């Protein structure tokens, strides 16, 4: 995944 912090 990209990640929720991007």
């Amino acid at each position, epitope marked *: 995944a*990209v*990640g*929720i*912090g991007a």
Partner: antibody
Amino acid sequence: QVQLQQSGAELVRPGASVTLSCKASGYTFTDYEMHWVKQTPVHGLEWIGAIVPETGFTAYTQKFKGKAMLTADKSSSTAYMELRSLTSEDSAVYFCSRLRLYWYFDVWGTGTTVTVSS
Amino acid sequence: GVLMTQTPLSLPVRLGDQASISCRSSQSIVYSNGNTYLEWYLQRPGQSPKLLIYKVSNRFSGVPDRVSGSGSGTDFTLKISRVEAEDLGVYYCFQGSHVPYTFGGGTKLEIKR
């Protein structure tokens, strides 16, 4: 070795709360996000949400808002998921998984079984 | 969010035969750069999910070359050119491009012998 150690099986009464823990080992806790995944025979795998330990920022799928709340403790390198006002549909197995930004769910926790029953 | 529809729900396969699992997304799952965070996971009972494929076609470390992934548009496929006994379990596609992230419904692979 990388390790994600989850807490053991729970029996929780309906309408109560429980906190699940996931302790990271063998890597820097703040360098990865922590994600939570629900598993049931009826709905398979469901993404619950995630937390960035370094900042405390969180995100959730809409149906888990108000049901799950994620926190992280940098001092003990342990992520937490609190499940609140439990019903029988909260009986499941819950996993944690780490994520480096732009990478993948490479290491998973052992899994925690929760049974909501009076 | 993004709906991931997987087919079939159960796949009975003979040992040594070929297996193909399809995953479709309700909307584009291309991230803003043109990269696609489509992943495949396997779960055997009593065990944790295990990563197989990332970014549509790349094998995770230690995954055999008979397992491969591909996809164009909103259609994605996981393929096993020669099913072996240890491939049994439930396969899940996973969309990691758009929050909230979503899984497919799962495909149970069952081996014939």
